[PDB]
């Protein structure tokens, strides 16, 4: 199956996922002299104030934080959006080191960790009939820097150690998203994909331009995960990031003038 590694890796991924060479795939290099102000976008809203944190899984690619998406509580809404979308779960991409790990670029500068929170617009249902849409996704994409610690982010660091392996999970209840943000809402916007297999073309990319920082001890805990499962032999779960795709018939809006 599909990985990170130099067999399964990102240049092998289009021959059992042909739209990998597609029209509208992400991330991409965000050229920040081209991006253009769009005074059509409205203001951006996050409402993160009733989440509901439900569980932490090892997939075997990354750790997914999931939520209860059983009802409005947490939604993405305005900006670029039409409609609300309900979040379903974050998770992050990092490096071996701290100079890449992210999937998008800025300037084609890579950040040390890219982390993206998944919503799925309500007006189809169900997560697996928004992604059959052009619009059925909104991914909230955040820089991460090394630097001070985030206290906002310990709370995931110190429960890595219980899902080291692939397909190991543990409670993650009451946990606060809100506290992954940075101060400003700025962002970049453009219509893209996942940035994994099966690559599909239905994500509405928000991509914040203040990056949050975080310590180094905080990462060095991410690049102690496996990608292998329980009594495999160990293959640490670092450089979990997608290069940047072509851009194409594509243009990046700024949410600032
Ligand atoms: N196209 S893929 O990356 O999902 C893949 C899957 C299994 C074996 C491979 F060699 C391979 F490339
Ligand atoms: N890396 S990513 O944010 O594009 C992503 C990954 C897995 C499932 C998703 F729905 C998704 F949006
Ligand atoms: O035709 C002019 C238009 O060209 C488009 O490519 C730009 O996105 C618009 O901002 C501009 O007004
Ligand atoms: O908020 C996420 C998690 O943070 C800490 O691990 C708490 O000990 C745990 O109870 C909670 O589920
Ligand atoms: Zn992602």
Same mark, same amino acid.
């Given at each position: ?6 067999? @399964? ?14 029209? %509208?795939?992400?991330?991409?290099? #965000? ?23 439900? %569980?932490?899984?090892? @997939?075997?690619?990354?750790? &997914?934080?999931?939520?209860? $998406?059983?009802? $409005? ?14 979040? #379903? ?8 080191? $701290?100079?890449? =790990? ?32 052009? $619009?059925?996704?909104?991914? /909230? =994409? #955040? ?34 998203? %809100? ?12 219509? =893209? ?5 099966? /690559? ?5 990319? !928000?991509?914040?331009?203040?990056? #949050? ?6 990462? /060095?805990?991410? %690049?102690?995960? &496996? ?21 194409? @018939?594509?243009? !990046? ?5």
């Amino acid at each position: 199956h599909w990985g990170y590694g130099k067999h @399964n890796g990102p240049e092998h991924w289009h021959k059992d996922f042909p739209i990998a060479k597609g029209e %509208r795939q992400s991330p991409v290099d #965000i050229d920040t002299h081209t991006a253009k102000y769009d005074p059509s976008l409205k203001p951006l809203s996050v409402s993160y104030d009733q989440a509901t944190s439900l %569980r932490i899984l090892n @997939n075997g690619h990354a750790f &997914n934080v999931e939520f209860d $998406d059983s009802q $409005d509580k947490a939604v993405l809404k305005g900006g670029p959006l039409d409609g609300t979308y309900r979040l #379903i779960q974050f998770h992050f991409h990092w490096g071996s080191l $701290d100079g890449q =790990g992210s999937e998008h670029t800025v300037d084609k500068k890579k950040y040390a960790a890219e982390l993206h929170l998944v919503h799925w617009n309500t007006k189809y249902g169900d997560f697996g009939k928004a992604v059959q849409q052009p $619009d059925g996704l909104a991914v /909230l =994409g #955040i820089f991460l820097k090394v630097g001070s610690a985030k206290p906002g982010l310990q709370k995931v660091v110190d429960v890595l150690d219980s899902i080291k392996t692939k397909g190991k999970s543990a409670d993650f209840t009451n946990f606060d998203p %809100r506290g992954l943000l940075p101060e400003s809402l700025d962002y970049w916007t453009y219509p =893209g994909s996942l940035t994994t297999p099966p /690559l599909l073309e239905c994500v509405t990319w !928000i991509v914040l331009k203040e990056p #949050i920082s975080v310590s180094s001890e905080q990462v /060095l805990k991410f %690049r102690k995960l &496996n990608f292998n499962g329980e009594g495999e032999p160990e293959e640490l779960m670092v450089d979990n990031w997608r290069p940047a795709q072509p851009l194409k @018939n594509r243009q !990046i809006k700024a949410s600032f003038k």
